[PDB]
Amino acid sequence: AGFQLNEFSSSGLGRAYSGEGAIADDAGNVSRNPALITMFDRPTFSAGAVYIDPDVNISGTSPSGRSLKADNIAPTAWVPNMHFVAPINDQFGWGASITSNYGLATEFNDTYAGGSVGGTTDLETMNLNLSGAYRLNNAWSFGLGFNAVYARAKIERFAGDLGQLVAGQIMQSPAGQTQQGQALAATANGIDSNTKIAHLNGNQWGFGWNAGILYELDKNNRYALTYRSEVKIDFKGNYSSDLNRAFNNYGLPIPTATGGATQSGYLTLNLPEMWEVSGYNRVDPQWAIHYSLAYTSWSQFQQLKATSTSGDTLFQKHEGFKDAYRIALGTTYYYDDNWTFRTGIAFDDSPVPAQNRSISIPDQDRFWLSAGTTYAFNKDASVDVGVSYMHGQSVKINEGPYQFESEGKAWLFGTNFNYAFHHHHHH
Ligand SMILES: CCCCCCCCOCCOCCOCCOCCO
Ligand SMILES: CCCCCCCCCCCC[N+](C)(C)[O-]
Ligand SMILES: CCCCCCCCCCCC[N+](C)(C)[O-]
Ligand SMILES: [Cu+2]
Ligand SMILES: [Cu+2]
Ligand SMILES: [Cu+2]
């Protein structure tokens, strides 16, 4: 799922986010589907977070003989979520919410040998949503939302053992026996692993919109179609490189050097438009079944290019992602008044062409496996607890002069609190 994430609710967590867009047992889903707004009677609030704990590890050996082994490169994260749905009439209502649909955090030591392609990579995303729905009739409704997305991002790359790989290569060339070759090799050989080869940081606002269409046979079965617009963030950040300005222009793959001087960079980040189709099915007073299928057009994400105020390129990297799907299936079991249980299973193909993979975005196909509970205090307040396990297939990665093998699992824990308000008098 690239650097996308769909942890907007702890209840969603317990059911491997299946159905989401057809279930309305809590306000969290209006963030997923605007049409669901017309499924609430009174003001509803929801808020909580998901603690994500990844276990991604890298392995390999550089041509320099140095270890490309990198343990625990994906740090833990806390993804909060807040939701509020407010019916106005039996025909209109509005909802706001703060969730996060995109994020990533990979970090290697700055002395890592594959540093040139594995330093630090951060992308924080907070999505502010405000939207309304319309119950055209008893059969189905329509939603539509406005999105203000704030993103913080930071990219840092270092010289791994490139300096050595270069020097080593220069030593094997005829240029080797030369006083200039040796000199050159010495210079290359001299670049420390932690020499910052690229620095990009910046916060920028982005906007977009989403919509949804709910359809229900009765009040126990429904199906939906939602759309999340692509979102473009043109960052106005700071760029830098610690390599001597001399490296510049020869036309090497090296980012622009600035002698450590901070330049002004511009880069456009393209968050993929999203499309999902889901269904919820109550099949007993105590059993319901949910499922879905999402489609992200990851192809809108082709590359990251940092530019100067004069249009010159400081940094650039080809991503070449492709569209992919996510499939989910879960069941909720309403025990009694106070208790409710759930479980889910899912699978999402990777948007990253097994040949365009990077260690910076350790991504592979993922298989979810979740379970969760909801404890109702009194029809007005409840708490949700979710847990999920994401294991996957190990992959091989050929980036730069390196060959790695990446593997990764993840544990997810989440808690949410929900509260309803009295149903307001309306005609
Ligand atoms: C997408 C860019 C990331 C690639 C990192 C480029 C880092 C460049 O090198 C820093 C070391 O000094 C110069 C090396 O020569 C350029 C490429 O490496 C060639 C391998 O023999
Ligand atoms: C100042 C601009 C900062 C923008 C950095 C955006 C990072 C988005 C995360 C994608 C990770 C891809 N990678 C390897 C290029 O970092
Ligand atoms: C600031 C948000 C940080 C969120 C980073 C989320 C990392 C989730 C880890 C799953 C990556 C593993 N993989 C390859 C199996 O997909
Ligand atoms: Cu009412
Ligand atoms: Cu009232
Ligand atoms: Cu009245």
Q: Residue with the nearest Cα to atom 5 of ligand 2? A: 153
Parse the chain into domains and list their residue ranges: 1-427
Distance CA 212, CA 218 (A): 18
Q: Which pair of structure tokens corresponds to residue 202?
A: 């910046």
Mutate which of 166, 192, 359 for ligand 1 pocket (most atoms within 8 A of beta carbon): 166
Q: Which pair of structure tokens corresponds to residue 265?
A: 């960079």
Cα distance between the two ends of the chain: 45
Say if ligand 3 is within 6 A of residue 326 CB.
no
Say if ligand 2 is within 6 A of residue 105 CB.
no
Say if ligand 3 is within 6 A of residue 55 CB.
no
Query: Method used for this model?
Result: X-ray
Residues 323 and 296: beta-carbon distance below 8 Å: yes
Distance CA 321, CA 197 (A): 25
Atom number, ligand 1, closest to the C-alpha of residue 400: 4
Contact partners, residue 178, CB within 8 Å, separation at least 6: none
Distances (CA, A) of 386 to 49, 97, 344, 416: 10, 20, 11, 9
Express the helix, strand and coil content of the chain in percent, nearest 5 each.
10, 55, 35
Q: Residue with the nearest Cα to atom 1 of ligand 1? A: 317
Q: Which pair of structure tokens corresponds to residue 184?
A: 């050159």
Q: Residue with the nearest Cα to atom 9 of ligand 1? A: 254
Say if ligand 2 is within 6 A of residue 201 CB.
yes
Mutate which of 116, 249, 356 for ligand 1 pocket (most atoms within 8 A of beta carbon): 116
Q: Residue with the nearest Cα to atom 7 of ligand 3? A: 104
Strand 324-333 to 381-392 pairing: unpaired
Say if ligand 1 is within 6 A of residue 187 CB.
no
Residues 76 and 54: beta-carbon distance below 8 Å: yes
| Residue whose C-alpha is closest to residue 370's, from 417, 326, 414, 334 | 414
Say if ligand 3 is within 6 A of residue 362 CB.
yes
Tell me the structure's resolution in angstroms, rounded to a single decimal: 2.6
Say if ligand 2 is within 6 A of residue 200 CB.
yes
Question: 58: helix, coil or strand?
Answer: strand
Instruction: Give the number of whichever ligand sits closest to the CA of residue 192.
Output: 1
Distance CA 301, CA 304 (A): 8
Distance CA 329, CA 281 (A): 11
| Entry field: residues in the chain | 427
Q: Determine which helix (DSSP H) or strand (DSSP E) holds 106, and give its type and residue range.
A: strand 104-107
DSSP letter assigned to residue 15:
T
Alpha helices, DSSP H only, in 104-254? 162-172, 179-190
Q: Determine which helix (DSSP H) or strand (DSSP E) holds 10, and give its type and residue range.
A: helix 10-14
Q: How many angstroms separate the alpha carbon of residue 268 from the centre of ligand 6? A: 51
Torsion, Cα 108 113 116 121, to 10 degrees, reads: 0
Give long-range contacts, CB 8 A cutoff, 24+ apart: 275-278.
Answer: 275/225, 275/226, 275/227, 275/228, 276/20, 276/21, 276/32, 276/224, 276/225, 276/226, 276/228, 277/21, 277/223, 277/224, 277/225, 277/226, 278/18, 278/19, 278/20, 278/21, 278/22, 278/33, 278/223, 278/224
Say if ligand 2 is within 6 A of residue 269 CB.
yes
What backbone torsions phi and psi does residue 117 show, to the nearest 5 degrees? -135, 20
Instruction: Give the number of whichever ligand sits closest to the CA of residue 114.
Output: 1
Distance CA 160, CA 65 (A): 12
User: Strands (DSSP E) along 169-297, which ranges?
Assistant: 196-218, 221-228, 231-240, 263-271, 274-284, 287-296
For residue 411, give the amino acid letter.
W
Fold for 1-427, please state it. Porin (2.40.160)
For residue 282, give the amino acid letter.
R
Q: How many angstroms separate the alpha carbon of residue 341 from the centre of ligand 4? A: 28
